[PDB]
Amino acid sequence: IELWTTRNDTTSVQAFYAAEAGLQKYKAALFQQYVWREQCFTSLARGLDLDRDGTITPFVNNRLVLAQNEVVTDANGNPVGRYTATLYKDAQDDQLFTLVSEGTSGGAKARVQATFRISNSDYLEQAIFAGAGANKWLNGGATIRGGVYVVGNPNDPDQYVIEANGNFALYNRYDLTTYSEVTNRVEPSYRQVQDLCASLRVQYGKISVGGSTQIGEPNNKVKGVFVGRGAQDITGENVGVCRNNKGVCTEAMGGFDLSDPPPFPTLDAKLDSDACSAYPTWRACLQGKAALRIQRIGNILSVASPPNATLSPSCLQAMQSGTLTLDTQSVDCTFTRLDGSRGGFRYTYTGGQELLEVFGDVVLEGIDAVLNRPVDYRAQSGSAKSATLAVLKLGGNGGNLDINGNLLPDATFGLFPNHALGFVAEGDIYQRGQHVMAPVYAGGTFRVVKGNVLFGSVISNQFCTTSAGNQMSCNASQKAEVVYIRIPKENRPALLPSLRGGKPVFQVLSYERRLEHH
């Protein structure tokens, strides 16, 4: 709202009010279009979603009319004037917008206008976010339903960071009927999605694409391929080809398309997220927000949380060795709070279909974890049905995770992705179970066996596929698969990274009002 003192005649002041009525109405609407995108995502420079249903009305010749001859009314609801609000985008900078409201009132005409700089967070949505690798970021076959973001090595922007010549497919849809009886773990609205919002981004480096590689499909194809310094760093036999089961099928194709892009999140760097931004490091955050937190320096197991609640010796017995393996004997790491709330994790064994409930977030430092049998999970943190398990390194020991059986959420409790269990591993992750449904972070590398599929997302410094569980050699030629399933920001494991494309800004660069007639 803008208030000022004047000595102008009543006539011109009413012309100003008419215009200022238009500007401040649609400055609010413009800001509201800015908050609706901080909640598929498309930038403001490509139009507005005036409905708020995904229908975008674009800018024509950099201009978009928001209101033509709309009338301003007095307190009694009679016409005092008309105004016309027009929204203009800058030809050069796709973040600069000018809102203009020409007003008229009783034969007096006034014009007021404001320039904004608007940029959205653009929460990154990819099946695989890769880090810095070893000079290899994805090794071995893969079929990725979702985006793949790779950061690369800033001190070598000439390194092919993806030399896919076959053995690699990246799609922008999935349907969960194609997998063995896992559809009853996911919410109806989430079982077949045809817009995954996939893209290929590589911040530092080049990429090569050879025959039978498939970045998108002729029908449903990827929403952009933004690599390195420009379109120059998109090499290969298959660029511009978009025939079926070959080539790069893309809408847009240039260089890395992000300002303020996020670095690979690491335990020892600040992680600016709704839960962890106050702490100096992501690790300090996990440590401090953990419900259950156990450390292990050599043979000592020191409990650091819950500091005012008791544990069962069964719980601490299980991690004696420095490796928590679940398998065939139940382990109860829960405790009860002051107010009758539970905390920790509990792992029952059935004979059939196991259970691992997690109440709040739990982090084990200097401890490895292996879940050696299929297990259903249930997780909550008071209101929300989400939680995190962290295995962190401590003195170079621990921090690895092994999921050798299936790992799904329990249908009874909740359904994906309104029910998710997240995994932070500072070391490596090896999945030999056929189906695990979780968002996953591996500070080191994330290994997976041909044939097994992970639903959720992997953030990891390296991704690798292997021929068999026996193996740890990355050279593989068959395919593992990752299926990106968006998890809504609410009911998302708080202690996981929330990677943003850019910084959120809604800032006024200038404001002006001119009288144009009497």
Residue numbers in the entry: 1 to 39, 49 to 142, 144 to 528
Authors' description from the paper:
Natural competence is the term used to describe the uptake of “naked” extracellular DNA by bacteria; it plays a significant role in horizontal genetic exchange. Previous work on T. thermophilus HB27 by Friedrich et al. identified a locus containing five open reading frames (ORFs) associated with natural competence. Four ORFs (pilA1 to pilA4 [pilA1-4]) were type IVa pilin-like genes, and a fifth, comZ, encoded an unusual and much larger protein that lacked some of the sequence features characteristic of pilin genes. Mutation of pilA1-3 and comZ leads to a loss of natural competence, although piliation is maintained.
ComZ was crystallized and the structure was determined to 2.72-Å resolution. The structure had three ComZ molecules in the asymmetric unit, but analysis by the protein interface analysis server PISA did not indicate any significant crystal contacts. ComZ was not identified as a type IV pilin by PilFind, presumably because it does not contain key characteristic sequence motifs; however, the N-terminal domain adopts a type IV pilin-like fold, suggesting that it forms a structural component of a pilus fiber. The second domain forms a complex β-solenoid structure, which is inserted between the penultimate and last β-strands in the pilin fold through two short linkers. From a comparison of the three chains, the relative orientation of the two domains is invariant. The closest match was the type II secretion system pseudopilin GspK, which forms the tip of a pseudopilus heterotrimeric complex (GspK/GspI/GspJ). In fact, the β-solenoid domain is placed in line with the central axis of the fiber, placing it in an ideal orientation to act as a tip adhesin. Protection against reductive dimethylation was used in combination with mass spectrometry and site-directed mutagenesis to identify two lysine residues in ComZ which are involved in DNA binding. They are located between the two domains in ComZ, on the opposite side from the predicted PilA2 binding site.
